[PDB]
Ligand binder design. Structure first.
Ligand SMILES: CC(=O)N[C@@H]1[C@@H](O)[C@H](O[C@@H]2O[C@H](CO)[C@H](O)[C@H](O)[C@H]2O)[C@@H](CO)O[C@H]1O
Ligand SMILES: CC(=O)N[C@@H]1[C@@H](O)[C@H](O)[C@@H](CO)O[C@@H]1O
Ligand SMILES: CC(=O)N[C@@H]1[C@@H](O)[C@H](O)[C@@H](CO)O[C@@H]1O
Lengths: 165, 165
């Protein structure tokens, strides 16, 4: 069975393994070369202002030249996406489902996704009848018990609001 | 059909989606909370010196306190792993298959994985018959045609050295 990419339901490979053009995980030219879908593609996938605003898979950094990678060349000066070394303000959604903290910065972990989380992958953002009709952000679904999220547990049976199925 | 984690062959979810304890992708407590395997877990997965050297899935940063996340609290001062803001030296392989450039820094993209790449997910490293019996680094497989890599095309039929078949 396929492992990754279009053929694999959009899954990513573990440990920066390249997803080949055929939807399998590995390293070397056959996986990381022409048609590489994600992982440590070589060259790096195109991104940002060089890819219609598409972000890098696997949280790679998008360089000023619009290539995906890691290192100062990618995450440092001129970085236009991913875990750039520069702080990312929000208040305006964060990219890639990153949490907008109470202080208006993008990140993951409890300081961003916990108490005061404004948007993105918040830990426990309340919604629906339990929250007096509060709406979820990011077009997330409001689950039956009144938490914002995505996936079957939130968009499935009992989904109160958002893009229920 | 499982999507991710130990049920899904170690696959990751795209765009920081959490892999639930049951092997499905999504956001909210059911996915990111207790049992979260990868993605934007809340709290972050344990990592670094606090977790037997385990790295963060999805290239999250490992904080000083050994939790996975993003933002300066995770990638900045005290960062133990992932795309820390500090340059990452190598010469001591790079974690998670990052390329060790000719200059001894970890990253991905042609500057690291291309010409002069020492180890990790190098673009093209020769091995086996076609390279005077040269062995691959990182315990990669040597393909039939004499290129280093992982996956079916390299570890499968024709494999010369490394963890073949
Ligand atoms: C370059 C490419 O995609 N090659 C694929 C092979 O990967 C694939 O074999 C699969 O390999 C994956 C790991 O890469 C895993 O070992 C699977 O079990 C295996 O099937 C092969 C399948 O026919 O197609 C090649 O084109
Ligand atoms: C949780 C949070 O939002 N913290 C941010 C921090 O990540 C960022 O580096 C800083 C920049 O001034 O602003 C806040 O402290
Ligand atoms: C490809 C490579 O190794 N480049 C490194 C760069 O990442 C690092 O920031 C710099 C520090 O002086 O040294 C080199 O330029």
């Amino acid at each position: 069975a396929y492992e990754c990419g279009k053929q694999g339901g959009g899954a990513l490979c573990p440990n920066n393994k390249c997803c080949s053009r055929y939807g399998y995980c590995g390293f070397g030219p056959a996986y990381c070369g022409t048609g590489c879908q994600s992982g440590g593609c070589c060259p790096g996938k195109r991104c940002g202002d060089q890819a219609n605003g598409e972000t890098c898979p696997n949280n790679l950094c998008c360089s000023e030249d619009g290539y995906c990678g890691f290192g100062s060349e990618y995450c440092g000066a001129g970085c236009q996406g991913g875990p750039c070394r520069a702080d990312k303000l929000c208040g305006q959604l964060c990219p890639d489902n990153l949490c907008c903290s109470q202080w208006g910065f993008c990140g993951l972990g409890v300081e961003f996704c916990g108490d005061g989380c404004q948007s993105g992958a918040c830990c426990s953002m309340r919604c629906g009848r339990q929250a007096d009709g509060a709406k979820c952000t990011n077009n997330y679904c409001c689950g039956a018990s009144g938490y914002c999220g995505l996936g079957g547990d939130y968009c499935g049976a009992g989904c109160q609001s958002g893009p229920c199925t």
